[PDB]
Every structure is written in C-alpha cells, then in structure tokens.
Structure 1
Amino acid sequence: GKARAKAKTRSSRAGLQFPVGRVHRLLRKGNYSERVGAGAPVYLAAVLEYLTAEILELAGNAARDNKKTRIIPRHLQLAIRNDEELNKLLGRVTIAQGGVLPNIQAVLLP
C-alpha cells in the first residue's frame, strides 16, 4: 500500500478507491446495528472493491476471448462461471442477457 500517512479523503486514507465514507453511512441504515465502528467500512470497502476487481478482470478476459475491447453483461456472466468461487457467490444470479455456457454432452454428439 501507500508509504505515506498523508490523505485527502477517508478512502485515500485507507488506500481504497471505494467511497469508504459512504459505506460507513450505508451501514448506519437498514437497521443492521445501533452502532457502527470506524474500521468496519474500511474493512468492508476493501472487500467490495476486491471482489469487484476480480469479476472485472475475468470479464475483461472474457471480452478478449470474444476479441472485444468492451465488457458487456455476457462477459460478466462468462467470467462468473469460469471462476469456481465466483460461480458460487453469484452462482444463482440471473444476468440480463447473460446467455449460457455452450455445453453439449458427448452423448448428444455423433
């Protein structure tokens, strides 16, 4: 991470891109708890950002498989399935225009 103590924003203080201050705010709503700690949204924002990056990385690779320079819902869908762990976390999620994997069983072939 950063080698400096200096920060301009809470997120820049954490070294994250996600809106840590907002995450803290969101945790105060939905009645999850009466009190929310300072380290909670920092920890959580890092998690959300990390997972976000993993999907996007793999989707970028899916875009490449299709020789594209652009991520579309389909590329996100393919990324999720190819990665076993994401295929559980979001395994049951329906993606608008995600399509399906091109799987045909051997018994169906010549």
Structure 2
Amino acid sequence: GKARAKAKTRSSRAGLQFPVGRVHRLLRKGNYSERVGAGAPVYLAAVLEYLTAEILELAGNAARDNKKTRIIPRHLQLAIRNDEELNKLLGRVTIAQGGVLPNIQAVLLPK
C-alpha cells in the first residue's frame, strides 16, 4: 500500500496554529463523551488561538511601556486586570509572582 509522503497537518489545513490533532486526542481521551465530532477540535483550537492572541497582545503592550523586551508574570497580571472582560473571565485565578494592581482610595490620599 502506497500513501502520501509527508502529508499536511490538519492545523495547516485549518489555518490555525494550535495542534488540532492533539486537541482531538485530548477530547477523545478526556471522557467528555464516548464519541467526538470532526470539526469540534478545529473550533476549540480557533477559540484558544483567539484567547491567546488577545492576552499576549495586551501583555506585550503592557511590557512595551515598562521599557522591557521580555514578558514577565507582572506584565500578564497588568494586562488581565486592566481589561474588564478578561478580569471577569479570570476573576478567581491567582497569577504566581504577579503582584497586585496599584490603586489608592481617594479618602486615604493626603489633603
């Protein structure tokens, strides 16, 4: 039996970057249901792409203003807490070594 040599991956055919095959394997092995559809891993990979792109764009924007060329946990923390949508999506999560947003109440400010 002859088959195509070095066949294209499903991720490249879908135009995404996250591994559609790995997502499908995780869905099948995670026992979420006995049978897993065909387009579900593609859609999940696309959603994960969107979320990662948004959070990384914001983290890089935050890090650029700190005159730093590398993303650290502090930049991620500043990125999430400054956007209401990501803040309410990640309300009950703790970022290790990320610190706390700096804010002072009007009453405690001198004069």
TM-score, reference length from structure 1? 0.91
Return the offset for 1:30.
Answer: 2.1
- Aligned-pair identity in percent equals 100
> What RMSD, in angstroms, separates the aligned Cα atoms of the two structures?
5.2
* The 10-residue stretch of structure 1 (5-14 or 39-48) with the greater mean CA deviation from structure 2: 5-14
**Is the contact made by 1:19 and 1:45 (CA closer than 8 Å) also made in structure 2?**
yes
**Is the contact made by 1:80 and 1:91 (CA closer than 8 Å) also made in structure 2?**
no
Return the offset for 1:63.
Answer: 0.4
Unpaired segments ≥5 residues, structure 1:
none
Match of 2:29 in 1: 29
CA distance in 2, matches of 1:85, 1:52: 14
Return the offset for 1:66.
Answer: 1.0
**1:57 to 1:6, Cα distance in 2 relative to 1, 3 A:** farther
**Is the contact made by 1:59 and 1:76 (CA closer than 8 Å) also made in structure 2?**
yes
Show CA shifts across 1:72-110 (max 9, x none).
111111110111111011122100101001000010011
CA distance in 2, matches of 1:54, 1:62: 12
CA distance in 1, matches of 2:42, 2:88: 25
**Is the contact made by 1:16 and 1:45 (CA closer than 8 Å) also made in structure 2?**
yes
CA distance in 2, matches of 1:5, 1:84: 48
- Whether 1:82 and 2:85 are equivalent positions in the alignment is no
What is the number of equivalent residue pairs in this alignment?
A: 110
CA distance in 1, matches of 2:16, 2:40: 14
Return the offset for 1:7.
Answer: 8.0
**1:4 to 1:25, Cα distance in 2 relative to 1, 3 A:** closer
**1:34 to 1:73, Cα distance in 2 relative to 1, 3 A:** same
* The 10-residue stretch of structure 1 (15-24 or 5-14) with the greater mean CA deviation from structure 2: 5-14
**Is the contact made by 1:7 and 1:13 (CA closer than 8 Å) also made in structure 2?**
no
